[PDB]
């Protein structure tokens, strides 16, 4: 799977597009934090010291949906193989309506090391009807996170969201 195989998707995938063992670079996300860039509020943070740890569910408030910009801090370790052109394409849908796709290129990845990246999400302006529907139907908003190293898919994580606070 390459970036061209996901950049036009109009629905959540019916399954994971790669197996865990496709992660030959041993990329392991060890911290993920999201902060509202307009208030400094930390909206979510997690650290670690059958899905297989690839699905996460979020519980945010209805105010999330009116945010302008969110900053995500990612920490990850990397194994001993050099990692070049590490890229995430992450696509968010409500009921299979594409809300936004974010395409992030990680900076340089130091092998055999903990690395950090900051991703800035600029939220799409959502119509009032969408925001009300997404608040009313928790977990029907979902995302696919597709991670590529040298244009090949190495990790695929899934998420779903509630805004029912």
């Amino acid at each position: 799977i390459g970036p061209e195989d996901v950049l036009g998707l109009q629905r959540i995938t019916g399954d994971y597009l790669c197996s865990p063992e496709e992660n030959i670079y041993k990329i392991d996300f060890v911290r993920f934090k999201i902060r509202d860039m307009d208030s400094g509020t930390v909206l979510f943070e997690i650290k670690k010291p059958p899905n297989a740890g690839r699905f996460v569910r979020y519980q945010f408030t209805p105010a999330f949906l009116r945010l302008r910009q969110v900053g995500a801090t990612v920490e990850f370790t990397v194994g001993d193989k050099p990692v070049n052109n590490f890229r995430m394409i992450e696509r968010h849908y409500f009921r299979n309506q594409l809300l936004k796709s974010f395409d992030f290129h990680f900076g340089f990845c130091i092998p055999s090391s903990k690395n950090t990246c900051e991703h800035i999400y600029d939220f799409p302006p959502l119509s009032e009807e969408l925001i009300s529907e997404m608040i009313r139907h928790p977990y029907e908003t979902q995302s696919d996170s597709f991670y590529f190293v040298d244009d090949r898919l190495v990790m695929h994580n899934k998420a779903d969201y509630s805004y029912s606070g």
Binding site: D28, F29, V30, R31, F32, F44, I46, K47, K48, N51, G53, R54, F55, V56, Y58, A72, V74, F76, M88, E90, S143, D144, S145, M155, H156, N157, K158, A159
Partner: peptide
């Protein structure tokens, strides 16, 4: 989805 792994 980076939040999945971090748990």
């Amino acid at each position: 989805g980076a939040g999945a792994s971090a748990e």
